[PDB]
Coordinates of N, CA and C in Angstrom, one line a residue:
Chain E
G19 N -36.0 -7.1 -3.6 CA -36.7 -6.0 -3.4 C -35.6 -4.8 -2.9
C20 N -36.0 -4.3 -1.7 CA -35.1 -3.3 -1.1 C -34.3 -3.4 0.1
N21 N -33.0 -3.6 0.4 CA -32.4 -3.8 1.7 C -31.0 -3.1 1.3
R22 N -30.8 -2.0 2.1 CA -29.5 -1.5 2.0 C -28.9 -1.2 3.1
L23 N -29.5 -2.1 4.4 CA -28.9 -2.1 5.6 C -27.5 -2.0 5.6
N24 N -26.6 -1.3 6.5 CA -25.4 -1.2 6.7 C -24.3 -0.8 5.4
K25 N -25.1 -0.3 4.6 CA -24.6 0.2 3.4 C -24.2 1.8 3.5
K26 N -23.2 2.2 3.1 CA -22.8 3.6 3.5 C -23.7 4.3 3.0
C27 N -23.9 5.6 3.4 CA -24.9 6.6 2.8 C -24.5 8.3 3.4
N28 N -25.1 8.9 2.6 CA -25.0 10.5 2.9 C -25.9 11.3 3.2
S29 N -27.1 10.6 2.9 CA -28.6 10.8 3.1 C -29.6 9.7 3.1
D30 N -30.7 10.0 3.6 CA -31.9 8.9 3.8 C -32.2 8.6 2.2
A31 N -32.0 9.4 1.3 CA -32.1 9.4 -0.1 C -31.1 7.9 -0.5
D32 N -29.9 7.8 0.2 CA -29.3 6.5 0.1 C -29.8 5.2 0.2
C33 N -30.8 5.1 1.2 CA -31.4 4.2 2.0 C -32.5 3.7 1.6
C34 N -33.1 2.7 1.6 CA -34.5 2.3 1.2 C -35.5 3.0 2.0
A35 N -36.2 3.6 1.2 CA -37.5 4.7 1.3 C -38.4 3.9 2.8
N36 N -38.5 5.0 3.8 CA -39.2 4.8 4.8 C -38.9 3.8 5.9
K37 N -38.5 2.4 5.4 CA -38.3 1.7 6.4 C -36.7 1.7 7.2
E38 N -35.7 2.7 6.3 CA -34.4 2.8 6.7 C -34.2 4.1 6.9
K39 N -33.1 4.6 7.5 CA -32.7 5.9 7.8 C -31.3 5.7 7.6
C40 N -30.5 7.2 7.5 CA -29.1 7.2 7.4 C -28.4 7.7 8.5
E41 N -27.7 7.1 9.2 CA -27.1 7.4 10.7 C -25.9 7.2 11.0
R42 N -25.3 8.0 11.5 CA -23.7 7.7 12.2 C -23.9 6.8 13.5
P43 N -23.4 5.6 13.6 CA -23.4 4.9 14.9 C -22.8 5.5 16.0
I44 N -23.1 5.9 17.1 CA -22.5 6.4 18.3 C -21.1 5.7 18.3
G45 N -20.0 6.5 18.3 CA -18.7 5.8 18.2 C -18.0 5.4 17.2
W46 N -18.8 5.7 15.9 CA -18.4 5.4 14.5 C -18.1 6.4 13.9
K47 N -17.4 6.3 12.8 CA -16.9 7.5 11.9 C -18.0 7.8 10.9
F48 N -18.6 6.7 10.1 CA -19.4 6.8 9.1 C -20.7 6.8 9.3
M49 N -21.4 7.1 8.2 CA -23.2 6.8 8.4 C -23.1 5.8 7.5
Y50 N -24.3 5.0 8.0 CA -24.7 3.9 7.1 C -26.2 3.6 7.3
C51 N -27.0 3.0 6.5 CA -28.4 2.7 6.4 C -28.8 1.7 7.9
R52 N -29.6 2.2 8.4 CA -30.0 1.4 9.8 C -31.5 1.2 9.5
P53 N -32.4 0.2 10.3 CA -33.9 0.1 10.3 C -34.5 1.4 11.1
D54 N -35.6 1.8 10.6 CA -36.5 2.8 10.9 C -37.8 2.3 11.1
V55 N -38.2 2.1 12.7 CA -39.4 1.3 12.9 C -40.5 2.6 12.8
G56 N -40.0 3.8 12.7 CA -41.0 4.9 12.8 C -41.0 5.5 14.1
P57 N -41.9 6.4 14.5 CA -42.1 7.5 15.4
Chain Z
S8 N 2.7 -8.0 24.0 CA 1.6 -9.0 24.5 C 0.3 -8.4 24.4
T9 N -0.3 -7.5 25.4 CA -1.2 -6.9 25.0 C -1.1 -5.6 24.2
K10 N 0.0 -5.5 23.8 CA 0.3 -4.6 22.7 C -0.3 -5.1 21.3
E11 N -0.5 -4.2 20.6 CA -1.0 -4.7 19.2 C -2.5 -5.6 19.4
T12 N -3.0 -5.4 20.4 CA -4.2 -6.2 20.6 C -5.4 -5.2 19.4
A13 N -6.3 -6.0 18.5 CA -7.1 -5.3 17.7 C -8.6 -5.7 18.3
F14 N -9.3 -4.5 18.8 CA -10.7 -5.0 19.2 C -11.7 -4.6 18.1
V15 N -12.1 -5.9 17.8 CA -13.3 -5.5 16.5 C -14.7 -5.6 17.0
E16 N -15.7 -4.8 16.6 CA -16.8 -5.0 16.8 C -17.7 -5.1 15.6
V17 N -18.5 -6.0 15.5 CA -19.4 -6.4 14.0 C -20.8 -6.3 14.5
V18 N -21.5 -5.7 13.6 CA -23.0 -5.5 13.8 C -23.8 -6.1 12.6
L19 N -24.6 -6.4 12.5 CA -25.5 -7.1 11.3 C -26.9 -6.8 12.1
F20 N -27.7 -6.6 10.8 CA -29.3 -6.4 10.8 C -30.1 -7.5 10.1
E21 N -31.0 -8.0 10.6 CA -31.9 -9.0 10.0 C -33.3 -8.4 10.2
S22 N -34.1 -8.0 9.2 CA -35.5 -7.4 9.2 C -36.6 -8.8 9.1
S23 N -37.7 -8.2 9.1 CA -38.7 -9.3 9.0 C -39.9 -8.5 8.6
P24 N -40.9 -9.3 7.6 CA -42.1 -8.7 7.1 C -42.8 -7.9 8.1
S25 N -43.0 -7.9 9.3 CA -43.5 -7.3 10.2 C -42.9 -6.0 10.4
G26 N -41.4 -5.8 10.0 CA -41.1 -4.3 10.3 C -40.4 -4.6 11.3
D27 N -40.4 -5.5 12.3 CA -39.5 -5.9 13.4 C -38.1 -6.3 12.8
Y28 N -36.8 -5.6 13.5 CA -35.6 -5.8 13.3 C -35.0 -6.7 14.3
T29 N -33.9 -7.3 14.0 CA -33.1 -7.9 15.0 C -31.5 -7.4 14.6
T30 N -31.0 -7.1 15.7 CA -29.4 -6.8 15.6 C -28.6 -7.7 16.3
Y31 N -27.7 -8.0 15.6 CA -27.0 -9.1 15.9 C -25.4 -8.6 16.2
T32 N -24.8 -8.5 17.4 CA -23.5 -7.6 18.0 C -22.7 -8.5 18.4
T33 N -21.4 -8.5 17.8 CA -20.3 -9.3 18.5 C -19.1 -8.6 18.9
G34 N -18.2 -8.7 19.8 CA -17.3 -8.2 20.2 C -16.1 -9.1 20.3
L35 N -15.0 -8.9 19.7 CA -14.0 -10.0 19.7 C -12.6 -9.2 19.5
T36 N -11.5 -10.2 19.8 CA -10.1 -9.4 19.8 C -9.2 -10.4 18.9
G37 N -8.5 -9.6 18.1 CA -7.4 -10.4 17.4 C -6.1 -9.3 17.6
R38 N -5.1 -9.5 16.5 CA -3.8 -9.0 16.8 C -3.6 -8.3 15.6
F39 N -3.3 -7.0 15.5 CA -2.4 -6.4 14.5 C -1.2 -6.7 14.2
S40 N -1.1 -7.6 12.9 CA 0.1 -8.1 12.4 C 1.3 -6.9 12.0
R41 N 2.6 -7.4 12.0 CA 3.5 -6.7 11.6 C 3.5 -6.3 10.1
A42 N 2.7 -7.0 9.6 CA 2.4 -7.0 7.9 C 1.9 -5.6 7.6
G43 N 1.1 -5.1 8.5 CA -0.1 -3.9 8.4 C 0.3 -2.9 9.2
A44 N -0.5 -1.6 9.1 CA -0.5 -0.8 10.0 C -1.1 -1.1 11.5
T45 N -0.9 -0.1 12.3 CA -1.6 -0.3 13.2 C -2.4 1.1 13.8
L46 N -3.5 0.9 13.3 CA -4.5 1.9 12.9 C -6.2 1.4 13.2
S47 N -7.0 2.4 13.4 CA -8.4 2.1 13.6 C -8.8 2.1 12.1
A48 N -10.0 1.1 11.6 CA -10.3 1.3 10.8 C -11.9 0.9 10.9
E49 N -12.7 1.3 9.7 CA -14.1 0.7 9.8 C -14.8 0.4 8.5
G50 N -15.5 -0.3 8.4 CA -16.3 -0.3 7.0 C -17.1 -1.6 6.8
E51 N -17.9 -1.7 5.8 CA -18.6 -2.8 5.8 C -17.9 -4.3 5.4
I52 N -18.2 -5.6 6.1 CA -17.4 -6.5 5.7 C -17.6 -7.2 4.2
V53 N -16.6 -7.5 3.7 CA -16.7 -8.4 2.4 C -15.7 -9.6 2.7
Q54 N -16.6 -10.8 2.9 CA -15.8 -12.0 2.8 C -15.1 -12.3 1.4
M55 N -13.7 -12.3 1.5 CA -12.9 -12.8 0.2 C -12.8 -14.2 -0.1
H56 N -13.4 -14.8 -1.2 CA -13.6 -16.0 -1.5 C -12.5 -16.4 -2.5
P57 N -12.3 -17.7 -2.5 CA -10.9 -18.3 -3.4 C -10.5 -17.6 -4.7
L58 N -11.5 -18.0 -5.5 CA -11.4 -17.7 -6.9 C -11.3 -16.1 -7.1
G59 N -12.4 -15.3 -6.4 CA -12.3 -13.8 -6.6 C -10.9 -13.3 -5.9
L60 N -10.1 -13.7 -5.1 CA -9.1 -13.3 -4.6 C -8.0 -13.4 -5.7
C61 N -7.9 -14.8 -6.4 CA -6.9 -15.0 -7.2 C -6.9 -14.3 -8.6
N62 N -8.3 -13.8 -8.5 CA -8.3 -12.6 -10.2 C -7.4 -11.8 -10.2
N63 N -6.5 -11.7 -11.2 CA -5.3 -10.9 -11.5 C -5.6 -9.8 -12.1
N64 N -6.7 -9.3 -12.5 CA -6.8 -8.6 -13.6 C -6.7 -6.8 -12.8
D65 N -6.1 -6.1 -13.6 CA -6.5 -4.7 -12.9 C -7.5 -3.9 -13.9
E66 N -8.5 -3.8 -13.4 CA -9.9 -3.3 -13.6 C -10.6 -2.7 -12.7
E67 N -11.3 -1.4 -13.0 CA -11.7 -0.6 -12.1 C -12.9 -1.3 -11.3
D68 N -13.4 -2.2 -12.1 CA -14.8 -3.1 -11.6 C -14.4 -3.9 -10.3
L69 N -13.1 -4.3 -10.1 CA -12.5 -4.9 -9.0 C -12.4 -3.9 -7.7
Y70 N -12.6 -2.6 -7.9 CA -12.0 -1.9 -6.8 C -13.6 -1.4 -6.3
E71 N -13.6 -1.5 -4.5 CA -14.6 -0.9 -3.9 C -14.2 -0.2 -2.7
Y72 N -14.5 0.9 -2.6 CA -14.1 2.0 -1.5 C -14.6 1.3 0.0
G73 N -13.8 1.3 0.9 CA -13.7 1.2 2.3 C -14.4 -0.1 3.0
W74 N -14.0 -1.0 2.5 CA -14.6 -2.5 3.1 C -13.6 -2.9 3.9
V75 N -14.1 -3.9 4.7 CA -12.9 -4.6 5.5 C -13.1 -6.1 5.0
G76 N -11.8 -6.6 4.6 CA -11.9 -7.9 4.1 C -11.8 -9.0 5.1
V77 N -12.5 -10.2 5.0 CA -12.6 -11.2 5.9 C -12.0 -12.3 4.7
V78 N -10.9 -13.1 5.3 CA -10.2 -14.1 4.6 C -10.2 -15.2 5.5
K79 N -11.0 -16.3 5.5 CA -10.5 -17.7 6.3 C -9.9 -18.7 5.5
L80 N -8.7 -18.7 6.1 CA -7.5 -19.6 5.3 C -7.9 -21.1 5.8
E81 N -7.4 -22.0 4.6 CA -7.7 -22.9 4.8 C -6.6 -24.1 5.3
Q82 N -6.9 -25.1 5.6 CA -5.7 -25.9 6.2 C -4.8 -26.0 5.1
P83 N -3.3 -26.0 5.3 CA -2.6 -26.0 4.4 C -2.5 -27.3 3.7
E84 N -2.9 -28.4 4.1 CA -2.7 -29.5 3.5 C -3.8 -29.9 2.5
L85 N -4.8 -29.0 2.5 CA -6.0 -28.8 1.6 C -5.8 -27.9 0.6
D86 N -4.9 -26.8 0.8 CA -4.7 -25.8 -0.2 C -3.1 -25.5 -0.3
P87 N -2.3 -26.8 -1.0 CA -0.9 -26.5 -1.0 C -0.3 -25.7 -1.9
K88 N -1.2 -25.4 -2.8 CA -0.9 -24.4 -3.8 C -1.4 -23.4 -4.2
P89 N -1.6 -22.1 -3.4 CA -2.3 -21.1 -3.2 C -1.8 -20.2 -4.4
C90 N -2.8 -19.3 -4.8 CA -2.5 -18.6 -6.0 C -1.7 -17.2 -5.6
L91 N -1.5 -16.9 -4.0 CA -1.0 -16.0 -3.7 C -0.6 -16.2 -2.3
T92 N 0.5 -15.6 -1.7 CA 0.9 -15.6 -0.3 C -0.2 -15.2 0.5
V93 N 0.0 -15.4 1.7 CA -1.0 -14.7 2.4 C -0.6 -12.9 2.5
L94 N 0.7 -13.0 2.7 CA 0.9 -11.5 2.4 C 0.3 -10.9 0.9
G95 N 0.8 -11.5 0.2 CA 0.0 -11.1 -1.3 C -1.6 -11.1 -0.8
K96 N -2.2 -11.8 -0.4 CA -3.6 -11.6 -0.3 C -4.1 -10.5 0.3
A97 N -3.1 -10.0 1.6 CA -3.5 -8.8 2.1 C -3.2 -7.5 1.4
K98 N -2.3 -7.5 0.4 CA -1.8 -6.6 -0.5 C -2.7 -6.4 -1.7
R99 N -3.8 -7.6 -2.0 CA -4.4 -7.6 -3.1 C -5.8 -7.0 -2.7
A100 N -6.2 -7.1 -1.4 CA -7.3 -6.7 -0.7 C -7.3 -4.9 -0.9
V101 N -5.9 -4.6 -0.4 CA -5.9 -3.3 0.0 C -5.7 -2.5 -1.5
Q102 N -5.5 -3.3 -2.4 CA -5.4 -2.7 -3.9 C -6.6 -2.5 -4.5
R103 N -7.6 -3.6 -4.0 CA -8.9 -3.4 -4.4 C -10.0 -2.2 -3.5
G104 N -9.2 -1.9 -2.6 CA -10.1 -0.9 -1.7 C -10.2 -1.2 -0.2
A105 N -9.6 -2.0 0.3 CA -9.7 -2.7 1.5 C -9.3 -1.6 2.7
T106 N -10.0 -1.1 3.3 CA -9.5 -0.2 4.5 C -8.6 -1.2 5.5
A107 N -9.2 -2.3 5.7 CA -8.2 -3.4 6.6 C -8.8 -4.8 6.1
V108 N -8.0 -5.9 6.5 CA -8.1 -7.1 6.2 C -7.8 -8.0 7.5
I109 N -8.9 -8.8 7.7 CA -8.7 -9.9 8.8 C -8.7 -11.3 8.1
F110 N -7.7 -11.8 8.8 CA -7.6 -13.1 8.5 C -7.8 -14.1 9.8
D111 N -8.9 -15.0 9.5 CA -9.1 -16.1 10.4 C -8.2 -17.2 10.1
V112 N -6.8 -17.4 10.9 CA -6.0 -18.1 11.1 C -5.8 -19.5 11.5
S113 N -7.3 -19.8 12.2 CA -7.4 -21.0 12.9 C -7.0 -22.2 12.2
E114 N -7.1 -22.3 11.1 CA -6.8 -23.6 10.3 C -5.2 -23.5 9.8
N115 N -4.9 -22.4 9.9 CA -3.5 -22.3 9.3 C -2.5 -21.4 10.2
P116 N -2.5 -22.0 11.4 CA -1.4 -21.0 12.3 C -0.3 -20.2 11.8
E117 N 0.6 -21.4 10.9 CA 1.7 -20.8 10.4 C 1.6 -19.5 9.8
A118 N 0.3 -19.0 9.1 CA 0.2 -17.8 8.5 C 0.6 -16.6 9.6
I119 N 0.3 -16.7 11.0 CA 0.6 -15.8 11.9 C 2.5 -15.2 11.6
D120 N 2.8 -16.4 11.6 CA 4.6 -16.1 11.6 C 4.8 -15.4 10.1
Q121 N 4.2 -15.8 9.0 CA 4.3 -14.9 7.8 C 4.0 -13.7 7.9
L122 N 2.7 -13.3 8.4 CA 2.3 -11.8 8.5 C 3.3 -11.2 9.5
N123 N 3.7 -11.8 10.5 CA 4.6 -11.2 11.6 C 5.9 -10.9 11.0
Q124 N 6.3 -11.2 10.1 CA 7.7 -11.0 9.5 C 7.7 -9.7 9.2
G125 N 8.6 -8.8 9.7 CA 8.7 -7.5 10.0 C 9.7 -6.8 9.2
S126 N 10.2 -7.9 8.1 CA 11.5 -7.7 7.1 C 10.8 -6.7 5.7
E127 N 9.6 -6.9 5.9 CA 8.7 -6.1 4.5 C 8.2 -4.7 5.0
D128 N 8.3 -3.8 4.0 CA 7.8 -2.4 4.6 C 5.9 -2.6 5.0
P129 N 5.6 -2.2 6.0 CA 3.9 -2.4 6.3 C 3.3 -2.1 5.2
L130 N 2.2 -2.6 4.8 CA 1.1 -2.0 4.1 C 0.5 -0.9 5.1
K131 N -0.3 0.0 4.2 CA -0.6 1.2 5.0 C -1.9 0.9 5.9
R132 N -2.6 -0.3 5.7 CA -3.7 -0.3 6.2 C -3.5 -1.8 7.3
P133 N -4.5 -2.1 8.2 CA -4.2 -2.8 9.2 C -4.6 -4.1 8.7
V134 N -3.6 -5.1 9.0 CA -3.9 -6.6 8.4 C -3.9 -7.4 9.9
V135 N -5.3 -7.7 10.4 CA -5.5 -8.4 11.8 C -5.5 -9.9 11.6
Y136 N -5.1 -10.7 12.6 CA -5.5 -12.0 12.4 C -6.4 -12.2 13.5
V137 N -7.3 -13.3 13.3 CA -8.2 -13.8 14.7 C -7.9 -15.3 14.6
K138 N -7.9 -15.8 15.9 CA -8.3 -17.2 15.9 C -9.1 -17.8 17.1
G139 N -9.1 -19.0 17.1 CA -9.9 -19.3 18.4 C -11.5 -19.0 18.4
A140 N -11.6 -18.7 19.9 CA -13.0 -18.3 19.8 C -13.5 -16.9 19.1
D141 N -12.4 -16.1 19.2 CA -12.8 -14.9 18.3 C -12.9 -15.1 16.9
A142 N -12.3 -16.1 16.4 CA -12.7 -16.4 15.0 C -13.7 -16.8 14.9
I143 N -14.2 -17.9 15.6 CA -15.6 -18.4 15.9 C -16.8 -17.3 15.8
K144 N -16.3 -16.4 16.7 CA -17.4 -15.2 16.6 C -17.4 -14.5 15.1
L145 N -16.2 -14.2 14.6 CA -16.3 -13.5 13.5 C -17.0 -14.3 12.4
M146 N -16.5 -15.7 12.4 CA -17.1 -16.3 11.2 C -18.6 -16.6 11.2
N147 N -19.0 -17.0 12.8 CA -20.5 -16.8 13.0 C -21.5 -15.6 12.0
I148 N -20.8 -14.7 12.4 CA -21.7 -13.7 11.8 C -21.3 -13.5 10.3
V149 N -20.1 -13.6 9.8 CA -19.8 -13.7 8.4 C -20.6 -14.7 7.9
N150 N -20.9 -15.8 8.2 CA -21.5 -17.0 7.6 C -23.0 -16.9 7.5
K151 N -23.4 -15.7 8.1 CA -24.8 -15.4 7.8 C -25.1 -14.7 6.3
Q152 N -24.0 -14.3 5.9 CA -24.3 -14.0 4.3 C -25.1 -13.0 4.1
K153 N -25.0 -11.8 5.1 CA -25.8 -10.3 5.2 C -24.6 -9.2 5.2
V154 N -24.9 -7.9 5.4 CA -24.3 -6.9 5.0 C -23.9 -6.5 6.3
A155 N -22.9 -7.0 7.1 CA -22.2 -6.7 8.5 C -21.4 -5.5 8.2
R156 N -21.3 -4.6 9.3 CA -20.4 -3.6 9.1 C -19.3 -3.9 10.7
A157 N -18.2 -3.7 10.6 CA -17.0 -4.0 11.5 C -16.4 -2.6 11.9
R158 N -15.9 -2.5 13.0 CA -15.1 -1.5 13.4 C -13.7 -2.2 14.1
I159 N -12.7 -1.6 13.9 CA -11.4 -2.0 14.3 C -10.8 -0.9 14.9
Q160 N -10.4 -1.2 16.6 CA -9.8 -0.4 17.2 C -8.5 -0.8 17.8
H161 N -7.6 0.3 17.9 CA -6.4 -0.2 18.7 C -6.6 0.5 20.2
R162 N -6.1 -0.1 21.0 CA -6.3 0.3 22.3 C -7.7 0.8 22.9

């Protein structure tokens, strides 16, 4: 299926549609895909 | 003593069909070895397995940018003829793009002395070792065989 959790991303287009979002964790340098439970 | 402490945070997600998700977070400490730099680093964990690490080829296919390698060393009596020294394994991971390398030295404490020889020029990235309860924490999450991300901090 689709699971890009904890993969690097530059935008939501690099993560799985709808159920993931691209975010820089607070205190970290890079952006990674994370779950998005909506909302 | 408290100098060269490496603080390592590891985060892993597990989803479910419901869309509920579990986050698994661990904080653990190891040491920056003299074989590498004392620098912060962060990236996706890749566990480096034995035959993959032995691959000698120079090909783009083997490069990935910005990952944190994890190597669990075997008992020396069970791995008496490795393909690379411990320093060579660190160098190889860095050549293949690792931003940092973490050795679990629990079963091969003698590797600490090999890594802490400062008679060679340091690698440009951190080469950290963990043992004991901290190594247990790291491998517990690495053994889930998912995509975890790790952040290594100095002080």
